[PDB]
Design a protein around this ligand. Structure first.
Ligand SMILES: C[S@@+](CC[C@H](N)C(=O)[O-])C[C@H]1O[C@@H](n2cnc3c(N)ncnc32)[C@H](O)[C@@H]1O
Ligand SMILES: O=[N+]([O-])c1ccc2c(c1)CN[C@@H](CO)C2
Ligand SMILES: O=[N+]([O-])c1ccc2c(c1)CN[C@@H](CO)C2
Length: 261
């Protein structure tokens, strides 16, 4: 992981956001787009109402919040995390509504649209901003991901992770441990909403050029099982030609709803 942590030193938030959350990938008007698909996944899952609790931790958040727009309405205590201060500064820049904050409103609007509870998007961002108490550092490679004195309520009633594990591990085995490490932050019976890349080996972020470990849905399933989870749901989005730009070589996106037994 020496090489890994060494590559993310050049990782630029603004470029990453521009590469994955601005058009075309950041267009939500097209129903078949990858953004609507992800929001539908989270919305639908929480819509079952069978994923609930007090505290929630977002593993490997980076500069994005979209992954919590639906969840933020089922957990009062939300803990966001990331390995780079640079990302925690960008996140903060959005949370404290500072200047130069990324514009996630398209994603907020689409979440309100999908949930169908007549909620305006300003009110949703408001609620999300309120339930996010802290933004802490994390290293999914450490046996104890958050360290020791962490202000984060452990265990957590639920964990949310999108595009992290596979993007920070050099091999399957490394990805397999990384999963276990965060699985220690969840109480049994708890839930895991995991989103990740499929068969991707690299992606860019400004000056950074990161190496990803190419995982398949079958391997993701097998690792969840081989980690103490029951697969409640496992979905695959096959990346469409028009969303295959020069920013990476991702072939698809997966969503898994896993419960720690
Ligand atoms: C491709 S991004 C995912 C961003 C966001 N969660 C999303 O949905 O687009 C991977 C993130 O993992 C972070 N990261 C790097 N090394 C890490 C490590 N050792 N443990 C945990 N996260 C790490 C990076 O800083 C980056 O924000
Ligand atoms: O299609 N997308 O909306 C989307 C969003 C984020 C990311 C990807 C694709 C692929 N690369 C990952 C990092 O491994 C980050
Ligand atoms: O409860 N479900 O409706 C449901 C639907 C699909 C799947 C599961 C459960 C669990 N196994 C995965 C493997 O990819 C597929």
């Amino acid at each position: 992981q020496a090489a890994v942590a060494s590559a993310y030193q050049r990782f630029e938030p603004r470029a990453y956001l521009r590469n994955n959350y601005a058009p075309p990938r950041g267009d939500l008007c097209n129903p078949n787009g990858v953004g609507p698909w992800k929001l539908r996944c989270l919305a639908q899952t929480f819509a079952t109402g069978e994923v609930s609790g007090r505290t929630l931790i977002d593993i490997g958040s980076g500069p994005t919040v979209y992954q919590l727009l639906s969840a933020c309405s089922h957990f009062e205590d939300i803990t966001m995390t990331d390995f780079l201060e640079v990302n925690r500064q960008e996140l903060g820049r959005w949370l404290q509504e500072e200047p130069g904050a990324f514009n996630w409103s398209m994603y907020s609007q689409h979440a309100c649209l999908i949930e169908g509870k007549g909620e305006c998007w300003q009110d949703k961002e408001r609620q999300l901003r309120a339930r996010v108490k802290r933004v802490l550092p994390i290293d999914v490679h450490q046996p104890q991901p958050l360290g020791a004195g962490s202000p984060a309520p452990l265990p957590a009633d639920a964990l949310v992770s999108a595009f992290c594990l596979e993007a920070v591990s050099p091999d399957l085995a490394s990805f397999q441990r990384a999963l276990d490490h965060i699985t220690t932050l969840l109480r049994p019976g708890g839930h895991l909403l995991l989103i990740g890349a499929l068969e991707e080996s690299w992606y860019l972020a400004g000056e950074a050029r990161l190496t990803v470990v190419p995982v398949s849905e079958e391997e993701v399933r097998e690792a969840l099982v081989r980690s103490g989870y029951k697969v409640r749901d496992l979905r695959t989005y096959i990346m469409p030609a028009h969303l295959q730009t020069g920013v990476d070589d991702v072939k698809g996106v997966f969503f898994a709803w896993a419960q720690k037994v």
